[PDB]
Every structure is written in structure tokens, then in C-alpha cells.
Amino acid sequence: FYTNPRAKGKKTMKFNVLLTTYEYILKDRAELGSIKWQFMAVDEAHRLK
DNA sequence: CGTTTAAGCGGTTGCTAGAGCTGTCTACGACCAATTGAGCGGCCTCGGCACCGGGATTCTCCAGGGCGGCCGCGAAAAGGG
């Protein structure tokens, strides 16, 4: 995730696109909600109906 | 300890049960008065068990009649002087 993971400060990102599923969104919402996302793409949006 | 499997969580999709609210009404139960008949106590009487007097029935005992054994006793046959 982090370009500088050993630093104690605000760590910048290293990746560009993160592919995930719904289960790990509901499992790791605390570790993924504190990221300033620029774009979001949700496949099979009828699950979000 | 290795492996499988089913619990846990999230999700669909419609209908129905049930809680809550508002409204109406009707049968049902509280209430009261008059009444009376079912419950509690006593009083009287019979069914059955028991007590007492009287009469019929069977078992035990005392006395009479007959028979056996003794007690010397006494008439009689045989021996002796």
C-alpha cells in the first residue's frame, strides 16, 4: 500500500488501482475508508440495488 | 492433526401474521330485590348383631347280679391195740 510503510507519519500510497470484492469491503471498511480515493468503479451494480 | 463441512453473514422476493390505532355495537356480566330450597343440626326408627331364657341331645358314674377263691370244719374211710 505505502511507498514509505516504515514511517510513522502520513504514508503516501504506492498503488494506482486496487481490485477487491464486496466481502473484503464489508470486512475491511476501517482500513479502506481512510483513503482519499480519486475514482471508484463498482461492477454488477444491481447488487447495490 | 488433516480434512471436510456446515455455521455465520449478507441478499432476494413476495405474502401473511401480528402489533398498534380508531370506531361501532351488542351480547354478557355486575348489581339489586324477592324468593325459596339446599345445607346443617337434631329427632325418630329399622337392620343387623348380640344377650338371655327355654327346650332337645349325648356323655359319665354308681349300684346290682353272678362267679371264683379261701377257711378251717366236719363227716367218713382205713389203720392200730
Q: Whose CA is closest to A1, among A47, A43, A35?
A: A35
Footprint of strand B on the protein (CB under 7 A): A 26, 47, 49
The answer to whether A2 touches A12, Cβ cutoff 8 Å, is yes
DSSP string, A8-47: SS-PPB--S-----HHHHHHSHHHHSSS--S----SSGGG
CA A42 to C1' B10, in angstroms, rounded, equals 17
Query: Per the structure block, which three cell numbers stand in for A6?
Result: 516504515
CA distance A13 to A32: 12
Resolution (A): 2.9
Q: 510503510: which residue's cell?
A: A5
Q: Which nucleotide is nearest to A26 (CA to C1')?
A: B10
Q: Which nucleotide is nearest to A22 (CA to C1')?
A: B10
CA distance A3 to A27: 24
Query: Per the structure block, which three cell numbers stand in for A5?
Result: 510503510
Question: Is the backbone of residue A44 left (phi > 0), alpha (psi -120 to 50) or beta?
Answer: left
| SS3 call for A5 | coil
